[PDB]
Amino acid sequence: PTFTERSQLKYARRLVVKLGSAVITREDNHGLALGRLASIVEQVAECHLEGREVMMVTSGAVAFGKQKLAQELLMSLSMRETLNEPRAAAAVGQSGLMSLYDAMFAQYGVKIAQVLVTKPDFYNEETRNNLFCTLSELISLNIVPIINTNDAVSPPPIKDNDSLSAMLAAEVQADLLILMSDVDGIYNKPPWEDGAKLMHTYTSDSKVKAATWALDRGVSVVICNGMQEKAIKTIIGGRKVGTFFTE
Amino acid sequence: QELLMSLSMRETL
Numbered sequence: 001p002t003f004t005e006r007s008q009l010k011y012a013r014r015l016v017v018k019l020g021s022a023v024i025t026r027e028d029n030h031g032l033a034l035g036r037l038a039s040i041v042e043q044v045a046e047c048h049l050e051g052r053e054v055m056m057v058t059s060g061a062v063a064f065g066k067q068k069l070a071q072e073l074l075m076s077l078s079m080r081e082t083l084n085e086p087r088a089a090a091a092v093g094q095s096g097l098m099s100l101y102d103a104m105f106a107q108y109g110v111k112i113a114q115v116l117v118t119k120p121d122f123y124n125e126e127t128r129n130n131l132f133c134t135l136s137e138l139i140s141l142n143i144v145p146i147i148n149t150n151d152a153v154s155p156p157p158i159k160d161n162d163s164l165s166a167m168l169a170a171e172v173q174a175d176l177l178i179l180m181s182d183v184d185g186i187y188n189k190p191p192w193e194d195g196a197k198l199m200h201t202y203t204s205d206s207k208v209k210a211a212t213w214a215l216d217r218g219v220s221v222v223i224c225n226g227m228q229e230k231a232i233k234t235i236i237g238g239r240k241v242g243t244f245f246t247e
Numbered sequence: 248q249e250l251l252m253s254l255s256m257r258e259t260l
Contacts, residue, residue, distance in 0.1 A: 075256050082256060 002175065003220040004246050007238050012220075014053045014139070015176035015236075017044060018165040021060035022182035023226035024097075029067065036227065038104055040180075043232040044144070045108040053139045057147045057168060059161040064096055065089025090151035101146060113143045116150040119158055122167065132171055139172075162207055166214035166221070177219045178235060179207060184225040186243040202245045211245050221245040 003009060019040060026033050048054045066089045098114045105112050115134070121127045138145045147168060149156055158164050162179065169177040186199040186208070202211075211221040224231045224242035234241050251259065 077256055078253055079251075079256060079259065080253055 001215060001220060001247055002218060006240060006244055009176065009222075009236050009238055012052065012176040012236060014055075014172065014174045015047075015178060016055055016057060016165060016169040016172070016174045017178050017232065018057040018161065018180060019059055020161075020181050020226050021063060023180060024058075024060035025063040025067075029063070031067065032064070032100070037100070039229070040232065041101070041104045042108075043230070045105060045110050047232060047236060048110060048142075048144060049108070055135070055139060055145050055147065055168075055172070057161060057165040058097065058101070059148070061093035061097055061148065061151060062086060062089050063093065065091065065093030068092045068096060086155050087152050090155070094148065094152060098146070105144065111143050113138050113145045115145045115147050117147060117164070118150045118154050119156050122158055128171075135168075135172055160206065163210045163213075166210040166219075169214050169219045169221075170217040174219055176236070177214055177221045178232060179211065179221060179223045180226045180231060181207060181223055182226055183223075184228075184242075185223060199243045200240050202243055204247060215245045215247075 003012070017040070023036050023040070024033060025031075044054050044056060069085070069089050069092060094114075094116070098112075101112055115138070117131065121131060135145060147164070149161060149164065158167060165179065166177065168174075184198070186202065187195070187197060188199070189195045207223060211223060214221050222235055222242050222244050224235055228241070231241065
C-alpha cells in the first residue's frame with residue numbers, strides 16, 4: 001500500500017495491466033473488439049515508451065479460438081449436410097492473439113514476449129523463482145511480456161486470470177495493478193437494486209478477494225471499466241475512475 | 248449433380 005491517493009498514481013513505476021475477456025471479444029461473438037484492443041495497446045505502448053515498465057496479463061484466448069473453430073467446422077461439411085472444446089480453441093486463439101498483439105505493438109517499435117504459465121508453476125519453488133528471474137530479465141530489456149495461462153494442454157488460490165494477475169503483481173513487486181474488468185467499479189449492491197453508489201476509495205467477490213490479497217502485499221489495486229475510453233491514461237493521469245484500493 | 252452435391256464445402260471453393 002505504498003500509494004494512498006489518486007494523485008500519487010503519476011509516479012507508478014511498474015504497473016501490471018490485466019485485460020479481461022469482455023474487453024477483447026464483442027457481444028456478437030463475430031470477431032474482436034479491435035477498437036478496444038487497439039486502444040489499450042496504444043495506451044500501453046505510450047505509457048511504456050515513457051519510462052514505466054508495464055507487463056500485460058492478457059486473456060480471452062478461448063473466445064477467439066471458438067470463433068476460428070466454428071468457422072473451420074462450417075467450412076468442412078458436405079454440401080449434403082449444409083442444405084439441412086476448451087483446448088483446441090485455446091491453442092488456435094493463443095496463436096492468433098499473439099499474432100495480432102505482435103503486429104499492433106511492432107507498429108510502435110515495442111517488442112512482446114509470449115510467456116505462458118500453468119498452475120503447478122506457482123507451486124514448485126524452483127520454477128517460481130526461475131519465472132521471477134525470467135520476468136525481470138524480460139522487463140529490464142524493454143520487452144512487454146504478455147503473460148497468459150497454458151490453456152492448450154492443461155486448463156486451470158490461482159483459479160482465473162485475475163488471481164494470477166494479483167500474484168504476478170505481488171511477486172514482481174509492482175506499484176500499480178489495473179484490473180480492467182467489465183463492470184464500472186464496485187457498489188454496495190448490484191445496480192438493479194437499492195443503493196447504487198460507486199466506491200471510488202475502498203476502505204477496510206473473486207475480484208474483490210484478489211484485490212484484497214494484492215493490497216495486503218505492497219501493491220495498489222485499481223478496478224476499472226474495460227469498455228471505457230482512455231482507461232489507463234486517466235487511471236494513471238489521476239482522474240477518479242474505477243475504485244481505488246487502499247487502507 | 249450426383250457427385251458435386253457430396254463434396255466438402257472446402258473442395259468446391
